[PDB]
Symmetry: C3
Subunit: 504 residues, 3 copies
C-alpha cells in the first residue's frame, strides 16, 4: 500500500521550496542562506554537545551486554559470513562526498590552518579532517541504525522510522502529533539529502570535464545520468550489490595507484600520524566553540564543523535505513563495531593518500590549489602523476557510479517509508522519487529538528532493548542469584553463631 497521509504533506513542501528556488522571488531563497545563521550560532552548541555524546553512548552500548542481543528473530543466521559481511559496509560507507572534499580538506587545513593553530600543521590537518569524517559522523548513523534495525528485525515490526519511538510515545498509538510528523520530516531530509550529492555530482563535472573539454552545461549533464535512474532500478533487475565491488576496484585502484605512484613513504608515515593526532586532539576538537578561542571560531565552525554535523543528521535517515538492511542476523556489537572502526578507518587511510600527497606537493611548491576550487584539486594532483588522465577518467566514472549508488539506495529508503514501511521492491515509487554555496545549506535547515529526534532516540532505543527478552532474562536472573546467595549467607552467620556460643 501507500501512505498518502505522509506523501501529501511531503511534496507540497518539497516543491513549495523546489519551485520556490527556481521561481517566484528567485533570490528570496538567499534569505534562508542568511537564515541558517540563526540556527548555527543558536544551536551550534546543541549539535556539538550532543554530537559527541552520540559517540560515547553508542560505544558504551556495544560494550554493554545489550550488544550480544542479535538483530532478528531469536537465533538467526548472518546474511553474510564474517568475511563476506565485511565487503558489505563499503556499499554504503563511501560516496561522492569523499572525492571532492576528500583531497581538499587536509590541504585546505594545511593551507589556512584551523582556528587555534598555526598554518602548515600536517598533524592538525589530519586530526580535524578525520574528526568530521570518521568516529563522529558514523555514530549519528549507528544510533538511528540500531533503533531502526532493532525496531524491525528483532521486535518484528514496521520499516517506518518514527516506529522506533513507540517505546516513548507508546506503541501503535504514536501516529499523529508525534509520528506521522517524523516520517514527513523524514522523507524531506532524504530528498534534499540526496541532491546534496546528486546535483553536486553535476557540479563536480561542471568543473570536472575541464580535464578533457560551464555554469549551464549542468542541465545537459544532469539528464545524461538521471536518464539512467529509471534503468538501474526500474528497467534493470536488482539493487546495488554490483556497484559495491565496482567502488572497490575503481577506488581501490586509483588509491593503490597513488599509494605506489606518489611517494608511498610519506603517506604511509602519516598512517599512524593520522590516528595518533586524532586521538590527541579529539577531546579538544569537541570543545571547540564559537566561544573558542576568544570566541572567533564561529564562522570557521559554522562553515566546517557545524556544517557537517547538521548535514550528517540530515542524511542519517537514508543511512540508518540502508544500514539496517544487510545487518539482519548481525548482532548489536558486531554491527556497532561494524559501522564504526572500519568505515571510520577506511576514510582515514583515504585522506592519508589523497591528503598526504596533496600536502607533500605544497611542501615543495607543486600546489594543487586550483584557484580555491573543490573540483579542481582532485585532478590537479593526479594529472601530476603518470597517466593523470588515464586515472582522471576512472575518477569521473567513479563519480558516475556513485551518482546512482546514492540515488538507487536513497530512493530504496525514501520509497520504503511511503509504503507503510514494507521492504518489497517498489519499482513505481523508486522511480518517482528519483527525480525529486546554496548547495550546502538546503539540506541542514530542512531537518533541523532531527537533531532532537536522534537525541530523544537514545532513550527510545535504550528504553526498548532493555526489555529485550535475553537482557530481561539476564537482569531477572541477577536478582535470583543476588538473593539466593543471600539465604546461603544469612544462615551460616546463625549456624556459625549458634555453634560459636556452643564453645562456652
Amino acid at each position: 500500500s501507500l501512505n498518502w497521509s505522509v506523501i501529501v504533506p511531503a511534496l507540497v513542501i518539497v516543491l513549495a521550496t523546489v519551485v520556490w528556488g527556481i521561481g517566484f522571488k528567485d533570490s528570496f531563497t538567499n534569505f534562508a542562506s542568511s537564515a541558517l545563521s540563526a540556527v548555527v550560532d543558536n544551536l551550534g552548541w546543541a549539535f556539538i554537545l550532543f554530537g559527541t555524546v552520540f559517540v560515547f553512548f553508542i560505544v558504551v552500548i556495544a560494550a554493554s551486554k545489550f550488544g550480544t542481543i542479535r538483530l532478528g528473530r531469536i537465533d538467526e543466521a548472518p546474511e553474510f559470513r564474517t568475511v563476506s559481511w565485511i565487503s558489505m559496509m563499503f556499499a554504503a560507507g563511501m560516496g561522492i562526498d569523499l572525492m571532492f572534499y576528500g583531497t581538499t580538506e587536509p590541504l585546505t587545513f594545511y593551507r589556512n590552518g584551523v582556528p587555534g593553530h598555526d598554518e602548515h600543521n600536517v598533524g592538525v590537518a589530519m586530526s580535524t579532517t578525520m574528526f568530521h569524517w570518521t568516529l563522529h559522523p558514523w555514530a549519528i548513523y549507528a544510533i538511528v541504525g540500531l533503533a531502526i534495525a532493532y525496531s524491525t528485525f528483532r521486535v518484528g515490526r514496521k520499516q517506518l522510522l518514527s516506529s522506533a519511538f513507540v517505546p516513548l510515545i507508546g506503541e501503535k498509538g504514536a501516529e499523529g502529533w508525534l509520528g506521522k510528523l517524523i516520517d514527513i520530516l523524514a522523507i524531506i531530509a532524504t530528498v534534499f539529502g540526496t541532491a546534496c550529492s546528486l546535483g553536486l555530482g553535476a557540479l563536480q563535472i561542471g568543473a570536472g570535464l575541464s580535464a578533457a573539454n560551464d555554469w549551464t552545461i549542468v542541465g545537459i549533464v544532469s539528464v545524461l545520468t538521471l536518464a539512467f535512474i529509471f534503468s538501474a532500478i526500474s528497467g534493470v533487475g536488482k539493487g546495488i550489490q554490483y556497484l559495491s565491488n565496482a567502488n572497490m576496484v575503481l577506488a581501490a585502484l586509483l588509491a593503490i595507484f597513488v599509494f605506489v605512484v606518489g611517494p608511498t613513504v610519506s603517506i604511509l608515515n602519516l598512517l599512524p600520524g593520522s590516528i595518533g593526532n586524532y586521538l590527541s586532539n579529539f577531546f579538544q576538537m569537541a570543545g571547540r566553540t564559537a566561544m573558542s578561542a576568544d570566541g572567533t571560531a564561529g564562522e570557521w565552525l559554522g562553515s566546517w564543523t557545524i556544517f557537517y554535523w547538521a548535514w550528517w543528521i540530515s542524511w542519517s535517515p537514508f543511512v540508518g535505513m540502508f544500514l539496517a538492511r544487510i545487518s539482519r542476523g548481525r548482532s548489536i556489537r558486531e554491527f556497532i563495531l561494524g559501522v564504526l572502526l572500519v568505515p571510520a578507518g577506511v576514510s582515514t587511510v583515504w585522506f592519508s593518500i589523497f591528503g598526504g600527497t596533496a600536502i607533500v606537493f605544497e611542501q615543495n611548491g607543486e600546489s594543487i590549489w586550483g584557484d580555491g576550487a573543490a573540483e579542481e584539486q582532485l585532478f590537479g594532483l593526479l594529472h601530476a602523476l603518470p597517466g593523470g588522465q588515464i586515472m582522471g577518467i576512472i575518477a569521473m566514472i567513479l563519480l558516475g557510479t556513485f551518482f546512482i549508488t546514492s540515488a538507487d539506495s536513497a530512493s530504496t529508503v525514501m520509497g520504503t517509508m511511503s509504503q507503510h514501511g514494507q521492504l518489497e521492491a517498489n519499482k513505481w515509487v523508486t522511480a518517482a522519487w528519483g527525480v525529486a554555496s546554496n548547495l550546502q545549506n538546503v539540506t541542514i535547515v530542512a531537518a533541523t529538528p532531527f537533531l532532537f529526534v536522534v537525541i530523544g532516540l537514545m532513550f527510545a532505543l535504550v528504553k526498548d532493548l532493555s526489555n529485550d527478552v535475553i537482557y530481561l532474562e539476564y537482569r531477572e536472573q541477577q536478582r535470583f542469584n543476588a538473593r539466593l546467595a543471600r539465604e546461603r549467607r544469612v544462615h551460616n552467620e546463625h549456624r556459625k553463631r549458634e555453634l560459636a556460643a556452643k564453645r562456652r
Copy 2:
C-alpha cells in the same frame, strides 16, 4: 555521652587561633602563615599527586567488583528515590563558594592566563576552573563518604572517621594513640574549611552592601555576628521542621542561574557547555601534571594561590560532605554511589561557572570588563549590575549568602557535634551551636587579621589545618581497600569463580 578527650583538644586549637591572632600581637599570626609557604613548597607535590590519585582511586573501586556491594545489610535498597537522592546532591553541590568564585575564578584565568597558557584563553581558563570543582574535589568527598557510609552501614560501626580505620588500626577499641587523633584532625579541618566559606562569604556580603548603600572594617564584624546570632534562632530555637532553607537556597540560586542565562550572552553560555566539558577532558592530564616545575618552575606561585588551595580546601571539608553524602546514601551500591557523586554534583559546577563566570569572560571581550578594580569579592555584584535590574538581584545575592551561612554552619556544626560525641546520629542541639560559634569565631578571626588582604590570610591557615588531614584521607584509601576485600560479597564471589573454574577443571 560527649567525647571530651576529643572535644577539648579540638577547641584548644580553635581558641589558640582566635586568641593568638587578634587579641594579642596580631602581627605574629601572619608568621604561621609563613609556614604555609612551607607546606606548599615541600609538601606541595603530594597534594598535587594524591589529588589526581583520589580520582583514579575512586573510579577503579567503582569500576571494581566492589562496586556491587550494597551500603547497608546484604541486598539492601536505598531509603529514597534515585531522583530524590540526586535531588539531594545539587544542594550539596552549591553554597557560598560558588557565589564567591563563580565569576572571578574563570575570569582571573582569562584576564591573566594560566601558566602554560597565553592570556585571554577561554578553553583553558574554563577547563582549569572545571578542574578545581568537578571530579578531583568530588573524588575526595566520595573517598571519605564511602568510608563513612560503609563503616556505619555495612560493618555497623560508629559514624566516626576513626571507625573507618579500624581495619588498619587497633582495634580492641579503636582510637587509642591514634583515632582520637584522627577525629581531632577532622573537627579542626572541618572548622577552618567551613570557616573560609563563612569567611569569604561574609566579606562577599560587606561588598554587596555597596549595591544598596554607600555606606567598613568594623562592618564585617557585624555581618557575621548577626547571622551568627541567627544560627541560634536557627538551631537554638527550632520551629516546626528544621529543614527549610536548603530549598530556600536553591530557589534564589535558581533565579540567578536562570536570570543571567537569558539576559546574559545566552548562546555563549550555552556554547560553554560542550566547550568546557571538552577542554576539561582534553586538558585533564596536562593540568593534572602542573606542579611547580612547569612552567619553567614558574607555576609554583600560581599553584599556591589557586590550584593548591582547592586541594587543601576540598580535603578540609570532606569530613562534612563525607558524612552528608554518606548519611543520604544508605541504600546504594558503592558503584551507584560513586558514579552518582562524581557526575551529579559536577553537572551543576560546570553549568554554574559557565553562566556566572562565562559572562565575565564574554564581557571582557567587548571591553565592558567587570574587573571592578581587581578585587574578586565585588565581581559578583559588578557583573550583575551590567544587566537589566541587576541591582534587585544583588540584594537577593546578599540574602542568599545570608541563608547560606546558617545552612553552611548548621550542617557543619551537626557533623562536628556528631563526631565530637562518639558519632551519634542523634544530634545534641546544644553541642552543635557550640561548633557554630567556635567556627564562626575563627572564620571572623581570619578576616580581621589581614586588613586589605583579608582573603589571603584565610586561605593560608585553612591550608595548614588541611595539610594534616590530607594524610588522613590518603590513609583512608588503604583502610578502605582492606575493608572491601574482607567484605562478604567480594569474598563470597571469589569462592564462586575459583569454583566456576574448579568445577570445569575436573569434568574435562
Copy 3:
C-alpha cells in the same frame, strides 16, 4: 645437543663482520652505516606505528580472559610470592642505558626542545624521555616474553622464538623458510643489541675514568670487566641472581643520595609532573610521524625515537627470554602488568631524580651540559654535589656492574638458543659467545616484523587453549 645448523649461518656473519669493519676497510663499514637511514625512512612508519600498538595490544591482552590463566601447568603454585617476586623483576629495570641517558636525555630535550614545540619546557622534556623509556619498550618485550613462556611453560614447547610461531605456521612444519631464518636473526639481534649497550659502556668507562684518573686505555677496560665474565659463572655459580641484586642497591644508593642532597622537592615535584604529562602528551608524541611538523622531524625521529625502537626491537629475544624464564605458575596478568608497572616506576623516578636535577641545575644557571657529550654529563651533575667524586666512584662501578650481569646473561640466551632452546645449556657455549661483541638499528630491522607475527601467533594460539577450544568444539 649443540644445534650446528643455526650456529653456522650466524657464526659466519659474526666472524666476517668484525673483520670487514677492520684492516683498513674501516671506511666502507661507515658508508654502510648510512644505509641505515634507508630503513628509518621507509620503515620509519613501521616502528612508530607498531611500537604503540604492542602497548595497547598487551594491555588489551592482559585485560581479556587470557589474562587469568596461569603461565604453565594448570593452577600451579608460582616459584615466588609478591613481596619477593617484586625484587626479581627489578633486576631488569636498571642498566647501563639508564646511566648516561638518564641525565643527558631529559636535559637535552629541555635545552634544544623536541619537534613540534618550543624549548626550555620541563613537561615535554620529561614525557618525551619517559616515553622512549616506559610502556613502549616494555610491550616490545612483553610480546616476546609472554609468547616464549607460553610456548614452553604452558604448552611446554622448546624455548626458542620460532616455536612460538607454531600457531601461524604449523606443528613441526615451520622448519623451512620461516624459523631457521628466525633463530639466526635472533642471534645477530642479541649480539648487536647488547653491543650497543656495552659499546657505550666500554667507552663511558674510559670517559668516566676521566673523572677518576685524569685522564688505548678504552680497550684495556673491555678486558678488565670481560675477564670476570667467565670466572663468574664457570667456577662458582649464582652471578645472575647475586649481581643484579647488589647492582640495584648501588643504583638505589646513587639515586637516593642525589634525591636528598640534590634538591628533594624538584625531583619530588616531578612525580606528578612526569606522570600527568606522560599521559597528556601520550598520543601526540606517539603519532609523531616525521610528517610533523611541516616535514621537519624526519631527522630528530632518526636520531632517537626511531633508532630507539630498533635497538629496543633488537632487545626482544634476549630480554623477552629472561622475563619469561623468571615466571612460572604466575598468571600472565600478574606478569603483563608485572612488566609494565615496574618499568615505568624504576624508569620514571630514575629520570625524575637525575634528569630532573639536571633540568634544575640548568635553570639556576648551574649548567652541567658543557662541551656537549653524553658520557661526560652524568658525572657532571654528580661532582656538582657533596661527596660527588665519591658517589662518582660507585657510579663508575655501576657502569661495569650488570654489564657483567648483562654480558654473562646476554651470553645465556645464546647458549640456550644454541642447544635446541634448552633452558639448561653447557657452560662453554654461553661464555664463548660472551666475547662475540668483545648497525644496531638494521641489525634488527626484519625482527620488528618477527614481533608482529608473534602478536598473531599469541592471539591465534590461545584461542586454541583449553578454555576456548572446549567451547569451540561444542555447539559451534
